[PDB]
């Protein structure tokens, strides 16, 4: 049992405790860690590699699932309306909630012993890790059903299957548009955006669309954005008393907070009107994830940054310099050289003391240490890894929304009008949302607008 043992026996790779740890005084204890499943179990021939359980494509598989039995189970098979299943026990001000999962070992039940609210069921298994993630999953579930209803009235001749697939296709396209038009320019900054994601031309069947092993660790740069609380706000965007700022170590797997503490509208409001944490070289990640990760469901609070580093070792990822060289970036060999790259000598000194050489700095650690690119939230190394991955997911996807034959010229012109704030308007009781760009807008009322001003998705070009 990796969960309770400190013995390093496969598949356990527990994180050891250093002397003078600020939290774990018992040096015979450990932070539990299971090695990722090998692609070829027991082999002495193959170089160990890991598995991606999901479709790499930006296809809303977190909504629909990446496996056929699960995809079937998430659908409402009780009629021919092509809808996804909704919670049968609870509603959110008369609006759909995700169905519950029928888990034997449900972590969500341990977050509030009396509430007895189990984990939700979505396309991806992690849907209940934080209520803000649950809210985004619920929002998209509602958007599919809203689309499947709006298509039934336009085309009464279409059966269930056609309604489900056509709504799935639109949802998939919305995730692509929001990701590449609004999200990625703000992650990468404009120079990295032009370098790694130049204007789309067309599908290219020679572009490998797989997720690279390094991306699974590099995309964890998001851990530096995490706030130590979940912020909830009322219809006037004011702190929702009681508990408007719940510590993160009290929200992990707390599906009950979505059912009994106001639904998803206060959560979405808090996401829109609260600023993200800024990654700074001496303020990398908060103690709610660094000291108290999942503490109410486990024997010990975990350390997400430390888990990231142990994971990159588990995955056999090369160090910082090898990745800088892969990207065509200079490779600092010493503390003085690293100081220049990081434009921060104190940070270089700290890194060198730990690692001895920039060749050994773990990819996440080195990546998040780099100064941020102008109007971006990653340095050159992460911009390269992330930008290269997303170009492959776009140029390598036959069903990319702009690819000839996926949608008509008219359907594409209609899809270009979508936005995440408008999705929030059509599926919640929220009447005042963030102005575009939703990822930039963070101050109420300065960056907020009325839903009526936002154009809706015109489905006219879907009439058969």
């Amino acid at each position: 049992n990796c969960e309770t043992s400190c013995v390093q026996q496969p598949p356990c790779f527990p994180l050891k405790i250093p002397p003078n740890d600020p939290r774990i005084k018992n040096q015979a204890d450990c932070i539990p860690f299971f090695r990722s499943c090998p692609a070829c179990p027991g082999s002495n021939i193959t170089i160990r590699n890991q598995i991606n359980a999901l479709t790499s494509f930006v296809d809303a598989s977190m909504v629909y699932g990446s496996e056929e039995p699960l995809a079937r189970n998430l659908r409402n098979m009780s009629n021919q309306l092509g809808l996804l299943a909704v919670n049968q026990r609870f509603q959110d001000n008369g609006r759909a909630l995700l169905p519950f999962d029928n888990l034997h070992d449900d972590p969500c039940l341990l977050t509030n012993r009396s509430a007895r609210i189990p984990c939700f069921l979505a396309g991806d298994t992690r849907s209940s890790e934080m209520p803000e993630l649950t809210s985004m999953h619920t929002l998209l579930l509602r958007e599919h059903n809203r689309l499947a209803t709006e298509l039934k009235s336009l085309n009464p001749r279409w059966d269930g299957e056609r309604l489900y697939q056509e709504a799935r296709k639109i949802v998939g396209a919305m995730v692509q548009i929001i990701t590449y038009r609004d999200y990625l320019p703000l992650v990468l900054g404009p120079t990295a955006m032009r370098k790694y994601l130049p204007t789309y031309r067309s599908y290219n069947d020679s572009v490998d669309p797989r997720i690279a092993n390094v991306f699974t660790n590099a995309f964890r740069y998001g851990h530096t954005l995490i706030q130590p609380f979940m912020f909830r706000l009322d219809n006037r965007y004011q702190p929702m008393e009681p508990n408007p700022r719940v510590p993160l170590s009290r929200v992990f797997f707390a599906s009950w907070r979505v059912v009994l503490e106001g639904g998803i509208d206060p959560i979405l409001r808090g996401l829109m009107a609260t600023p993200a944490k800024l990654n700074r070289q001496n303020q990398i990640a908060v103690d709610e994830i660094r000291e108290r990760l999942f503490e109410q469901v486990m024997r010990i609070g975990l350390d997400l940054p430390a888990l990231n580093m142990q994971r990159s070792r588990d995955h056999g990822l090369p160090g910082y310099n090898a990745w800088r060289r892969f990207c065509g970036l200079p490779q600092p060999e010493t503390v003085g050289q690293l100081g220049t790259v990081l434009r921060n000598l104190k940070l270089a000194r700290k890194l060198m003391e730990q690692y001895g050489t920039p060749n050994n700095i773990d990819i996440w650690m080195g990546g998040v240490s780099e100064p941020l690119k102008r109007k971006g939230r990653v340095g050159p190394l992460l911009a390269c890894i992330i930008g290269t991955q997303f170009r492959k997911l776009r140029d390598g996807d036959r069903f990319w929304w702009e690819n000839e034959g996926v949608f008509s010229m008219q359907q594409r012109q209609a899809l270009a009008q979508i936005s995440l704030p408008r999705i929030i308007c059509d599926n919640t009781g929220i009447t005042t949302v963030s102005k575009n760009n939703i990822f930039m807008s963070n101050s109420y009322p300065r960056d907020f607008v009325n839903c009526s001003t936002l154009p809706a998705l015109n489905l006219a070009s879907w009439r058969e």
Binding site: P11, R35, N52, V214, F215, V286, P305, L351, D362, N442
Partner: protein, 103 residues
Amino acid sequence: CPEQDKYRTITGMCNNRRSPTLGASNRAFVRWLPAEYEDGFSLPYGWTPGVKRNGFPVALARAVSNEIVRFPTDQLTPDQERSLMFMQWGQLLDHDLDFTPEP
């Protein structure tokens, strides 16, 4: 692998017609660089006490976190140009791209 289709499969299979598992679920990640293991093929760096990586001792992941990541919560800097929605879309998007299973 059908010659003509209108919708994606659930597994991602057949998106690439020449190599139909590419981007499909439950497959090995692609590698952009050869892996680096203590024994060259399976054991992670830090697995064996005393075994150095490229001439240097392996730092404990928890020690790196304590020495480099740890900072006083009261000091947190809010990002004037990013919403928490920027953080949440990231995790949501990540959950459309990869999930690395464990035993």
